[PDB]
Amino acid sequence: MRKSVIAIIIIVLVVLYMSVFVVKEGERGITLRFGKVLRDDDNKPLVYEPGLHFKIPFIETVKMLDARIQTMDNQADRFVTKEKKDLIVDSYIKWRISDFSRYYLATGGGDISQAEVLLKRKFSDRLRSEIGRLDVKDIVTDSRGRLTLEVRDALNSNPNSMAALGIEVVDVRIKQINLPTEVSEAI
Amino acid sequence: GRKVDYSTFLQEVNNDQVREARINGREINVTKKDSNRYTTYIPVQDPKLLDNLLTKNVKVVGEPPEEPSLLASIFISWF
Amino acid sequence: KVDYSTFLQEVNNDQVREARINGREINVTKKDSNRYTTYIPVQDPKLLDNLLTKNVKVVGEPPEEPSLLASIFISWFP
Amino acid sequence: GRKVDYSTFLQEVNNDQVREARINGREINVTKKDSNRYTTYIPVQDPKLLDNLLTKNVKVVGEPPEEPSLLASIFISWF
Amino acid sequence: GRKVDYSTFLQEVNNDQVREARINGREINVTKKDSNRYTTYIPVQDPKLLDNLLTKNVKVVGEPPEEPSLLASIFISWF
Amino acid sequence: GRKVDYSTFLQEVNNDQVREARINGREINVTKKDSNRYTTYIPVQDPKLLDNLLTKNVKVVGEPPEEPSLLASIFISWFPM
Amino acid sequence: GRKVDYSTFLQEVNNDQVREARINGREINVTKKDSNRYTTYIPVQDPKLLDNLLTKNVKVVGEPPEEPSLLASIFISWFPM
Amino acid sequence: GRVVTIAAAAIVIIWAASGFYTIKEAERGVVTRFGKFSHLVEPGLNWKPTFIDEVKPVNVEAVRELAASGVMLTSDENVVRVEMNVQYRVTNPEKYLYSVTSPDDSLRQATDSALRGVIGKYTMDRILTEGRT
Amino acid sequence: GVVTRFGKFSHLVEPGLNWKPTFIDEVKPVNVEAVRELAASGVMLTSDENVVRVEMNVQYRVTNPEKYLYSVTSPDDSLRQATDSALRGVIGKYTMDRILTEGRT
């Protein structure tokens, strides 16, 4: 009868409209039912297109995680060389998500803040350990080939890897080097 | 309409990366220099904010008030 | 319709002759009689101080009390 | 009801020519030896006002604001 | 009750003749050291009144707020 | 509980006697180091009060507002109805 | 969540301990470095709070207001009718 | 008697339904009956009966970093200033729950003593430039 | 312009009405195909102990839009904020007088 047909149409349409999922052009996602990330015999499934367009339309939700090359920025911070000279150095990091499941389970919610904090810590640590050795001229003259590449390889490489957390780093650069006020005036 | 932390708002003000933001209530419609825009909230009453805006020479427009709505409530009391 | 800070730079050069203030609104009264509108964004402790530093006449104005007839009206108009 | 300006009130106080006031709300009823009756209106909350008043030894009075006892308003409630 | 000047009140506080002060919102109950009594009213919000009183060892008391009776709630429930 | 005067409370606080303070608007419950209890009342807004407390190591407390229960509120709204 | 005194919260902040804080009138949710959570209340209006928070590098967040829907007024006024 | 049976059945059904619960994204937990240690659980699809047992979350896989500081004292009658940071994660929820109270503060109080012990031996310039490794 | 339906790519559109019966389709025209400008400056150190001021300017052009969209975000940020490092790299090795004299070749 007309009422039954209309009710069935409405029910199926609601099934559709709350069962859909839409994944746009480069924002990879996750799958979580109610705690059971549906971790299969292999790693848990990843989702990139509205294939399996239907989800269980009332028990579960999923999270979309950006996948573009993210850029971290920071402010100046002082350092020191063996000649007791002190500098001002600013820099930046390019980081990429390597393996998504470990990243989400580890970082706790997948917002940028804690990843930023962890990378900030590790970068400050390794760089400050590196620049502390070479001499004042050697920072200025040829910093790229040795400093940037060596720190990249060391920071990217088990736990303590900064990849174990599930992050891939692209490359690191230094932006500007000033001097303190008094030495500036003297020179 | 992305949400941005007040902390980062100060982090961007201190190094002059905005021209303009609109003021109302305690919500702010923020427009950094490169034509990107978003929104933030001020957690408490701050005595120093306006000074932070003025001294750095960042230019800020505030908005006219919205008078409350009346006819809805009068109809509600009527029917 | 004119910016708060711009109003401030106008104050700095002593180019407004007197001041009309009302609530979070100020009616400008400058040397060349140009008029506009400017809104108070948030409480400013220094606004009155800065204006009084520069010998500008600054006028107060009565509250706008709602008429009593209007109150009993709205009470019993519905 | 001569509305002599708040700012005008300020400089005439700076001249140290006014002798007393009785205060209420936003309204300043302040008198000079002529028995001059006039008034101004508070622009916004002013901290320094009372200190300056103390410097000029001006007699100052207020009154406890009138409030309608629970007869008239609750009467138009019974009405 | 003699509604006396706030100016006189501050002056006598400077001259140390009061032993007790009782504070209700804006209203002021006074009892000075030589057993005389009077009344005064606070013009506006003050930054320094409480401190000035406390420094020179006048006693201060407040009283709890004027709580509305529940019987008013009964009345408004039936009216 | 025996009420006290604000000035007495402050004077005794600077004598290093107090350990706890609950605050709600204008009521303040005080418990000494000798474990007696009482109440006081702030006269007016005192911008220096919170400082004066914490600067001498008292363990202050803030406690929530009593929101009217929605059921009883809608009832006494509908008790007329 | 386990409530805490305000004084404990300040001794917390002075020792590089707080990550994120939400401010609503005077009710606060807190998240330490160590992934624990709790709640706190601000007794009295404080001018020096916010700056003290900011200088030590804590992440501070706010919340939008809750506007009462007109439909709620429709219901409450029209419930008899 | 039918009404009593229907009411009892409804009560027991509500009981059982309220028994179910949820766990959130791979956080280990310990659920114990009457207080006696019963068993662990993995996230999702678990049912707690009422007034027997207690369910405890642990929030395991998190990164959990702490800090340290101190204007300290060094070998050759000199004064330095340093900082520190440490990252840690929890493996067994059981011992972490039932060893000490507020277990984070324990690592925190330990790291300061550790840092002083290490910083004691060496001298000024070595502490400055060469020897951080 | 870039067209997207079903969350995925759809063909680049040479300007036109592109006669379609669809509104569920999403089209991104924000890209431009004309020259545009960024510039930078800084008080940058010299090989020997010396300080100098140097500034330049760059002109850039987009060829493949999809790499301009679905890659490292916020383009001008990456451009400017790597150009500064490149400018340091060049300015570093040369002496103060040489930077004064042969700055343009």
Q: Tell me whether residue G74 is in a domain.
A: no
G33 contact H CB<8A: yes
Residues of D with CB below 8 A from E43's CB?
23, 50, 60, 62
Q: How many other C-beta atoms are found inside a 10 Å radius of the C-beta of residue H68?
A: 18
Cα–Cα distance measured from residue G18 to residue G59, given in angstroms and rounded to the nearest whole number: 8
Chains I and A touch (3+ CB pairs under 8 A): yes
Q: Which residues of H114-132 are buried (b: 16+ CB within 10 A; e: fewer)?
A: ebeeebeeeeeeebeeeee
Task: Give every CB contact of residue F55 below 8 A, 6+ residues apart in sequence.
Answer: none
Give the distance from residue G25's alpha carbon to the nearest chain A alpha carbon, in angstroms: 25
| Residue of H65, H129, H133 to mutate when probing chain A, most A C-beta within 10 A | H129
Q: Domain range for residue G23?
A: 1-65
Cα–Cα distance measured from residue I64 to residue I68, given in angstroms and rounded to the nearest whole number: 7
Give the distance from residue F61's alpha carbon to the nearest chain G alpha carbon, in angstroms: 5
Give the distance from residue E54's alpha carbon to the nearest chain F alpha carbon, in angstroms: 7
Q: Tell me whether residue F43 is in a domain.
A: yes
Cα–Cα distance measured from residue H82 to residue G40, given in angstroms and rounded to the nearest whole number: 32
Chains B and H touch (3+ CB pairs under 8 A): no
Q: Are D56 and D16 in contact (CB under 8 A)?
A: yes
Give the distance from residue B61's alpha carbon to the nearest chain C alpha carbon, in angstroms: 5
* Beta pairing partners, A66: none
Q: Which of residues 94-123 of H touch A (CB under 8 A)?
A: none
Side-by-side strand order, sheet with D39-41: D39-41, D27-31, D20-24, D59-61
The crossing angle, in degrees rounded to 10, of helices A149-156 and A112-131 is 130
Q: Are G49 and G28 in contact (CB under 8 A)?
A: no
What Rg value do the Cα atoms of chain A yield, rounded? 25
Task: Give every CB contact of residue B67 below 8 A, 6+ residues apart in sequence.
Answer: none
User: What was the experiment behind these coordinates?
Assistant: cryo-EM
Q: Tell me whether residue D40 is in a domain.
A: yes
Question: From residue H132, how far is each of A129, H84, I96 by CA, in Å?
Answer: 7, 12, 36
| Residue of I3, I8, I55, I90 to mutate when probing chain A, most A C-beta within 10 A | I8
Cα–Cα distance measured from residue G78 to residue G72, given in angstroms and rounded to the nearest whole number: 10
Q: Which residues of D10-40 are buried (b: 16+ CB within 10 A; e: fewer)?
A: beebeeeebbbbbbeeeebebeeeeeeebbb
Cα–Cα distance measured from residue E44 to residue A19, given in angstroms and rounded to the nearest whole number: 63
Secondary structure of residue G3 in the 3-state scheme: strand
Give the distance from residue A4's alpha carbon to the nearest chain I alpha carbon, in angstroms: 30
Give the distance from residue H64's alpha carbon to the nearest chain G alpha carbon, in angstroms: 5
Q: Are A74 and I78 in contact (CB under 8 A)?
A: no
Cβ-defined contact of F60 to G6 (cutoff 8 Å) = yes
Task: Give every CB contact of residue C69 below 8 A, 6+ residues apart in sequence.
Answer: none
DSSP H or E stretch at residue F13: helix F6-13
Cα–Cα distance measured from residue G78 to residue F78, given in angstroms and rounded to the nearest whole number: 11
Burial class (CB in 10 A: 0-12, 13-18, 19+), C21: buried
Cβ-defined contact of C21 to D43 (cutoff 8 Å) = yes
Give how many domains chain C has, as a whole number: 1
Burial class (CB in 10 A: 0-12, 13-18, 19+), D53: buried
For chain G, how many residues are written?
81
Cβ-defined contact of H23 to A35 (cutoff 8 Å) = yes
**For D21, which residue in chain E has the nearest alpha carbon?**
E5
Q: Tell me whether residue E18 is in a domain.
A: yes
For chain H, how many residues are written?
133
Task: Give every CB contact of residue D22 below 8 A, 6+ residues apart in sequence.
Answer: D29, D60, D61, D62, D63
Q: How many other C-beta atoms are found inside a 10 Å radius of the C-beta of residue C39?
A: 20
The candidate with the shortest Cα–Cα distance to G38, out of H102, A106, F65, F50, is H102
Q: Between I9, I85, I93, which is nearest A141 by CB?
A: I93
**For C24, which residue in chain D has the nearest alpha carbon?**
D44
Dmax (CA) for chain D in angstroms is: 55
Cα–Cα distance measured from residue E50 to residue E46, given in angstroms and rounded to the nearest whole number: 8
Question: From residue D37, how far is each of D20, D32, E7 by CA, in Å?
Answer: 11, 8, 20
DSSP H or E stretch at residue C44: none
Cα–Cα distance measured from residue F55 to residue F24, given in angstroms and rounded to the nearest whole number: 20
Query: Which residue carries 């991104």 as its tokens?
Result: I28
Question: From residue B49, how far is each of B18, C12, C34, C42 by CA, in Å?
Answer: 15, 20, 30, 9
Q: Are H43 and H28 in contact (CB under 8 A)?
A: no
Q: Are E17 and E33 in contact (CB under 8 A)?
A: yes
D59 contact E CB<8A: yes
Q: Which of residues 136-165 of A touch G (CB under 8 A)?
A: none
Identify the sign of the CA torsion C65, C68, C70, C74: positive
Cβ-defined contact of F64 to G41 (cutoff 8 Å) = yes
What Rg value do the Cα atoms of chain C yield, rounded? 17
Q: Percentage helix, strand, coil, to 5, in chain E?
A: 35, 30, 40
Pair of tokens at residue E28: 């002021």
